[PDB]
Design a protein around this motif. Structure first.
Motif, PDB file in Angstrom:
ATOM      1  N   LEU A   1      36.154  34.012  36.785  1.00  0.00           N
ATOM      2  CA  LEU A   1      35.147  33.051  37.747  1.00  0.00           C
ATOM      3  C   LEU A   1      34.114  33.367  37.462  1.00  0.00           C
ATOM      4  CD1 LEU A   1      34.865  32.692  40.425  1.00  0.00           C
ATOM      5  CD2 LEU A   1      34.692  34.685  41.321  1.00  0.00           C
TER       6      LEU A   1
ATOM      7  N   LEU B   1      46.977  29.751  47.292  1.00  0.00           N
ATOM      8  CA  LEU B   1      47.739  30.693  47.370  1.00  0.00           C
ATOM      9  C   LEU B   1      49.340  30.175  48.567  1.00  0.00           C
ATOM     10  CD1 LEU B   1      45.691  33.316  45.933  1.00  0.00           C
ATOM     11  CD2 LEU B   1      46.710  31.238  44.905  1.00  0.00           C
TER      12      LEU B   1
ATOM     13  N   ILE C   1      49.688  39.334  48.724  1.00  0.00           N
ATOM     14  CA  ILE C   1      49.185  40.003  48.291  1.00  0.00           C
ATOM     15  C   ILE C   1      49.332  41.263  47.382  1.00  0.00           C
ATOM     16  CG2 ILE C   1      47.813  38.558  50.494  1.00  0.00           C
ATOM     17  CD1 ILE C   1      47.892  41.780  51.441  1.00  0.00           C
TER      18      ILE C   1
ATOM     19  N   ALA D   1      45.938  42.713  39.070  1.00  0.00           N
ATOM     20  CA  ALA D   1      44.627  42.520  38.618  1.00  0.00           C
ATOM     21  C   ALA D   1      44.856  43.681  37.526  1.00  0.00           C
ATOM     22  CB  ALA D   1      43.551  43.100  39.310  1.00  0.00           C
TER      23      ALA D   1
ATOM     24  N   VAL E   1      49.369  41.495  43.587  1.00  0.00           N
ATOM     25  CA  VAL E   1      48.544  40.907  42.990  1.00  0.00           C
ATOM     26  C   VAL E   1      47.723  41.355  42.942  1.00  0.00           C
ATOM     27  CG1 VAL E   1      46.348  39.694  42.433  1.00  0.00           C
ATOM     28  CG2 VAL E   1      48.351  38.941  43.449  1.00  0.00           C
ATOM     29  N   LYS E   2      47.749  42.679  43.637  1.00  0.00           N
ATOM     30  CA  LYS E   2      46.587  44.552  44.407  1.00  0.00           C
ATOM     31  C   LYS E   2      47.055  44.879  43.171  1.00  0.00           C
ATOM     32  CE  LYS E   2      46.052  48.739  44.848  1.00  0.00           C
ATOM     33  NZ  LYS E   2      45.712  50.127  43.611  1.00  0.00           N
TER      34      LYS E   2
ATOM     35  N   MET F   1      39.351  37.781  46.206  1.00  0.00           N
ATOM     36  CA  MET F   1      39.850  36.357  45.765  1.00  0.00           C
ATOM     37  C   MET F   1      40.777  35.876  46.803  1.00  0.00           C
ATOM     38  SD  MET F   1      38.404  35.608  42.301  1.00  0.00           S
ATOM     39  CE  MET F   1      39.875  36.056  41.561  1.00  0.00           C
ATOM     40  N   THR F   2      42.298  37.106  46.725  1.00  0.00           N
ATOM     41  CA  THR F   2      43.149  37.261  47.117  1.00  0.00           C
ATOM     42  C   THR F   2      42.729  36.957  49.072  1.00  0.00           C
ATOM     43  OG1 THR F   2      44.291  38.430  46.171  1.00  0.00           O
ATOM     44  CG2 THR F   2      44.619  38.855  48.702  1.00  0.00           C
TER      45      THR F   2
ATOM     46  N   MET G   1      36.105  30.510  48.831  1.00  0.00           N
ATOM     47  CA  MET G   1      37.063  30.863  48.519  1.00  0.00           C
ATOM     48  C   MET G   1      38.278  31.650  49.449  1.00  0.00           C
ATOM     49  SD  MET G   1      37.268  32.929  45.898  1.00  0.00           S
ATOM     50  CE  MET G   1      37.216  31.631  44.710  1.00  0.00           C
TER      51      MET G   1
ATOM     52  N   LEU H   1      37.164  42.062  42.336  1.00  0.00           N
ATOM     53  CA  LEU H   1      36.946  41.092  42.509  1.00  0.00           C
ATOM     54  C   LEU H   1      38.057  40.182  42.652  1.00  0.00           C
ATOM     55  CD1 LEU H   1      35.230  38.565  42.844  1.00  0.00           C
ATOM     56  CD2 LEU H   1      35.703  38.054  39.961  1.00  0.00           C
TER      57      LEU H   1
ATOM     58  N   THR I   1      42.728  43.573  33.584  1.00  0.00           N
ATOM     59  CA  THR I   1      41.388  44.663  33.668  1.00  0.00           C
ATOM     60  C   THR I   1      41.362  45.005  32.199  1.00  0.00           C
ATOM     61  OG1 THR I   1      42.114  46.571  34.607  1.00  0.00           O
ATOM     62  CG2 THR I   1      41.256  44.657  35.658  1.00  0.00           C
TER      63      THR I   1
ATOM     64  N   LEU J   1      30.722  33.819  41.937  1.00  0.00           N
ATOM     65  CA  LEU J   1      30.831  35.428  41.865  1.00  0.00           C
ATOM     66  C   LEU J   1      29.303  35.698  42.441  1.00  0.00           C
ATOM     67  CD1 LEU J   1      32.182  37.944  43.011  1.00  0.00           C
ATOM     68  CD2 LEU J   1      31.579  38.287  40.648  1.00  0.00           C
TER      69      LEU J   1
ATOM     70  N   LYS K   1      36.795  43.887  38.039  1.00  0.00           N
ATOM     71  CA  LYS K   1      38.039  42.574  37.604  1.00  0.00           C
ATOM     72  C   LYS K   1      39.075  43.235  39.100  1.00  0.00           C
ATOM     73  CE  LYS K   1      36.731  41.197  33.163  1.00  0.00           C
ATOM     74  NZ  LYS K   1      36.083  42.053  31.900  1.00  0.00           N
TER      75      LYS K   1
ATOM     76  N   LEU L   1      40.942  41.240  44.605  1.00  0.00           N
ATOM     77  CA  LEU L   1      41.185  41.369  45.924  1.00  0.00           C
ATOM     78  C   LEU L   1      40.566  41.006  46.765  1.00  0.00           C
ATOM     79  CD1 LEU L   1      41.400  45.313  45.885  1.00  0.00           C
ATOM     80  CD2 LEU L   1      42.882  43.884  45.695  1.00  0.00           C
TER      81      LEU L   1
ATOM     82  N   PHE M   1      42.064  34.521  37.321  1.00  0.00           N
ATOM     83  CA  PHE M   1      41.480  34.125  37.793  1.00  0.00           C
ATOM     84  C   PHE M   1      39.725  34.948  37.972  1.00  0.00           C
ATOM     85  CE2 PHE M   1      38.981  32.226  41.375  1.00  0.00           C
ATOM     86  CZ  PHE M   1      39.087  30.962  41.087  1.00  0.00           C
ATOM     87  N   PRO M   2      40.445  36.337  38.145  1.00  0.00           N
ATOM     88  CA  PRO M   2      38.985  37.290  38.533  1.00  0.00           C
ATOM     89  C   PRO M   2      37.727  37.148  36.779  1.00  0.00           C
ATOM     90  CG  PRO M   2      41.382  38.192  38.282  1.00  0.00           C
ATOM     91  CD  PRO M   2      41.588  36.751  38.631  1.00  0.00           C
TER      92      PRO M   2
ATOM     93  N   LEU N   1      29.024  34.163  46.222  1.00  0.00           N
ATOM     94  CA  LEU N   1      29.837  34.439  47.009  1.00  0.00           C
ATOM     95  C   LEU N   1      29.426  36.753  47.796  1.00  0.00           C
ATOM     96  CD1 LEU N   1      32.910  34.461  48.112  1.00  0.00           C
ATOM     97  CD2 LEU N   1      33.542  34.796  45.903  1.00  0.00           C
TER      98      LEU N   1
ATOM     99  N   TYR O   1      40.823  28.720  48.684  1.00  0.00           N
ATOM    100  CA  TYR O   1      41.466  29.622  47.737  1.00  0.00           C
ATOM    101  C   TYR O   1      42.689  30.270  48.327  1.00  0.00           C
ATOM    102  CZ  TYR O   1      42.899  31.739  43.455  1.00  0.00           C
ATOM    103  OH  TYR O   1      43.659  32.888  42.156  1.00  0.00           O
TER     104      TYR O   1
END
Lengths: 358, 358
Positions: A317, A343, A226, A233, A229-230, B326-327, A336, B322, A237, A322, B319, B324, A313-314, A325, A339
């Motif tokens: 989405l 993962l 995790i 992203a 991916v913090k 999604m994680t 989700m 979103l 962006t 979104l 983004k 996080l 993916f974000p 959710l 998801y």
């Protein structure tokens, strides 16, 4: 004279890209020789490339736990700087170094989930509890036939109730050896184990029936992935959307595919088997554009591309999904949730794909 | 000769817009006389406008449960058609009719949450259980002083354990009358009620301490609102982004505000008081752009604008945030949870703002 580094680079180009697409002929140009290409003008990309290749080599040569962390942290600091000024530098390069840095932390996949399971059920005497399962009159043939997801449940039963307790379920063990966990799961709900520990037992049994760790996923540990991916992203962006020119979108689902997967998208099968809900629906369902995407994530394992569909993916989405959710639509949260399964399971099936020992 | 309709329209223009901004001077142009303006060229907007105004009138004249549903369903069918061909028709009109249709279903707010609470605790003899609380020697002064969130907990206690059981907590009732639920909540964890029903008791007491329905929100009913944001997103996704010209983005947070709320965004206070976590952080936190947004949602009640910030929220979610969620980042889910609070609570404080009876 970085020469150990040139060794690492050689190592990358010759030896680690075919793992990266996971396919020798499918898109080799990207990793075999677009990424090395870009790598020269941008040091965050070269740093990531070297650090990833070095982690891959440690599998054989002992050496360099050191240089991996070096190029790791170089790549990160430089990439942090590289984000804020995109004019000076290519974005395909930033995307690459993203995905590579991911796969690198993915290879440091030290999370072995059996520990996690008994974390959940009890709350050292940890390892080598097997000595009395496969070396046991009646648990041998069942343990000897099971797969690893179900071996875990049987081991969980022994830890709870000893080698000679588990041996008592003659009818269920003949059934589990017989692979009808369809109703072998049925015969286990009438067990006085299950009466005295119903919570632990029910979640053990679905593990035996299903395979997936469904019953335990909610309280699972999963977090070494995790963190990466913090920050990852952060660099999506920055670069989204990608320059009309940059090699990435095209590769992006053949650029979507005119929703060709959607024409029989209703028609693709669960593959999760746990949602088991509404999922026979046709078009008029806000889930489809995003359940079709999950199908596509499930449908292909090519390591780089799977990561690519995640990294993107974000930015992709469904605004209507979104929105649900964010409301709290149950189907939205429960796909989700599915998801975080795709993962967590992808790392499990990559490091199980990769050498562990022997 | 729709003349009842002209009556409804007159009713709108003169009488319901000041509820809509909820402010007589702040942006009256939009609702008082941009929306009526647009309403003439687009029938989905006129239909929504009439149906909303008619629901508002029913509060006084009995009449027309009929015409509300008519213009409702006209507005929906026509608006469904209106989405697919945006070239023929304005998008400010589509946004308007979105927000109006929302506020209309919001006014049919029949969900009274006390029923929901005892739904949760027990699983008709429902109404008029008060007869023995305010008409009771020692529960009068406490019930007579409490607010409605805490009156609910006291009523829950009587339903569980009778008028004369609840009267036993002399020290706690003197404390609840004394408003130190700070430690009146403390004196209630040592109650033999709490020992025999700890789950129900713990969630009753936080209701007494906090006010918010935190302990019960997770299993709450809330859904009459939700269905309307389902289709509502459908028309966000169509029109986003809005035409450089269309009157909407500017009004959109004065177009963001050069993140002026962010300079002391760290500095705005919880207002939830339940997250109570990390929330003293400064800038370098992926939560801020989206916790600052929640502050802004909380910070203003103007009915139309609050709905506007909601309708636009998925086209504007971070983004990196979103990603996080999604994680499965815990903070991400626990400030999306806090969003389903802001929402559920906004209806509670609008229909409590509005006439119920008397």
């Amino acid at each position: 004279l970085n020469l150990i580094d040139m060794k690492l680079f050689h190592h990358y180009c010759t030896k680690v890209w075919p793992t990266i697409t996971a396919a020798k002929v499918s898109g080799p140009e990207i990793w075999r020789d677009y990424i090395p290409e870009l790598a020269f003008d941008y040091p965050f990309l070269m740093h990531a490339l070297l650090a990833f290749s070095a982690t891959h080599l440690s599998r054989t040569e002992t050496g360099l736990e050191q240089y991996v962390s070096s190029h790791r942290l170089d790549a990160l600091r430089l990439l942090r700087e590289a984000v804020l000024e995109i004019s000076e530098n290519n974005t395909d390069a930033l995307v690459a170094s993203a995905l590579i840095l991911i796969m690198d932390s993915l290879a440091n996949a030290s999370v072995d989930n059996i520990f996690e399971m008994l974390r959940i059920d009890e709350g050292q005497d940890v390892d080598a509890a097997v000595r009395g399962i496969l070396r046991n009159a009646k648990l041998k043939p069942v343990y000897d036939s099971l797969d690893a997801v179900r071996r875990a449940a049987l081991i969980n039963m022994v830890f709870q109730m000893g080698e000679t307790g588990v041996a008592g379920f003659t009818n269920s063990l003949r059934m589990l050896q017989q692979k009808r966990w369809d109703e072998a799961a049925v015969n286990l709900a009438k067990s006085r184990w299950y009466n005295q520990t119903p919570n632990r037992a029910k979640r053990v049994i679905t593990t035996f029936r299903t395979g997936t760790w469904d019953a335990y996923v909610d309280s699972m540990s999963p977090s070494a992935w995790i963190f990466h991916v913090k920050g990852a992203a952060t660099i999506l962006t920055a670069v989204w959307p990608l320059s009309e020119r940059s090699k990435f979108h095209n590769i992006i689902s053949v650029d979507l595919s005119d929703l060709g997967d959607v024409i029989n998208g209703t028609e693709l099968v669960c593959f999760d088997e746990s949602i088991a809900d509404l999922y026979p629906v046709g078009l008029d369902s806000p889930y489809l554009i995003t359940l079709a995407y999950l199908d596509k994530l499930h449908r292909e394992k090519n390591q780089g591309d799977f990561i690519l569909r995640v990294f993107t993916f974000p930015a992709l989405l469904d605004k209507t999904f979104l929105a649900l959710l964010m409301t709290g639509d149950l189907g939205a949260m429960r796909i989700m949730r599915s998801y975080y399964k795709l993962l967590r399971g992808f790392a499990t099936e990559v490091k199980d794909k990769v050498w562990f020992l022997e």
